[PDB]
Design a protein around this nucleic acid. Structure first.
Length: 223
DNA sequence: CAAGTGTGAGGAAAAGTAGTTGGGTTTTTTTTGCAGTTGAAGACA
């Protein structure tokens, strides 16, 4: 559902997981890495789930001999994907993007699709209200501060935006027209995007993620 | 191509502390009336 919720891809990736993903067994949380150097044993189950997820997509889309997934179909999904508001979720992912990290969302900062800009300032006026409460900077200082905020009344000197499954539905429809070198390029293009998404919620390692990817790649070819 | 021991530093923050200054009393070490009086210069016998 996260994106190209290809209903079939749930069972695809569940199957490869079925496959060599811990001898077709639900990944359990790794162990009590007692040692202090915390090596990348890479046993964090999810990290591998996302890896199988990614792999599945391109393997699945990189050998859909029957041509079940049309050339022009793959980019359409990536297309429709091209960001968009979020019945709360995508707005959230913007808020996480804004921890100014490795610059994958930094520019989103820059762009920040109009309103996204607006509902952002809304969430700032509500949820960094706690912000704080100076005590011991002479009462006078406090008064001054109040006055300043004063002379800045501000805060106002379809309910419009939509929910999660609404957005999900509507891009599922935005692709609803379903029934060589370029597609390979498109596939790579799409995979980078998900790499962005899944990686962005998590500790990424614009390499480790990759390292993780590499790992099971190796794991797999022992058929 | 690959997994596995051993292990040093980089990093964060509130409060404190630094440096520089200034402030700061405290401190500490013009005549305008009266009547008289003395001393005075000058004269004299």
């Amino acid at each position: 559902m996260q994106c190209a919720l290809p209903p079939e891809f749930y069972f695809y990736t569940k199957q490869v997981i079925e496959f060599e993903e811990t001898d077709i067994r639900n990944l359990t949380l790794w162990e009590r890495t007692d040692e202090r150097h915390t090596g990348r044993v890479s046993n964090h189950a999810e990290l591998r789930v996302l890896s199988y997820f990614m792999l599945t997509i391109n393997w699945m889309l990189s050998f859909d001999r029957d041509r079940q997934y049309p050339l022009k179909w793959i980019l359409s999904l990536t297309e429709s994907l091209t960001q968009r508001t979020t019945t709360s979720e995508s707005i959230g992912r913007n808020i996480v993007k804004v921890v100014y990290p490795d610059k994958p969302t930094s520019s989103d900062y820059f762009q920040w699709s109009e309103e996204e800009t607006l509902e952002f300032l809304k969430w700032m006026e509500k949820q960094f209200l706690p912000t704080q409460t100076s005590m011991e900077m002479t009462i006078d200082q406090k008064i001054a501060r109040r006055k300043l905020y004063k002379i800045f009344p501000l805060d106002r000197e379809d309910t419009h935006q939509l929910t999660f499954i609404e957005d999900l539905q509507e891009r599922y429809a935005k692709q609803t027209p379903f029934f060589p070198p370029a597609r390979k390029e498109a596939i790579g293009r799409l995979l980078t995007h998900i790499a962005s998404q899944l990686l962005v919620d998590f500790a990424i390692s614009k390499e480790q993620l990759k390292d993780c990817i590499s790992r099971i790649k190796n794991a797999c070819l022992h058929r």
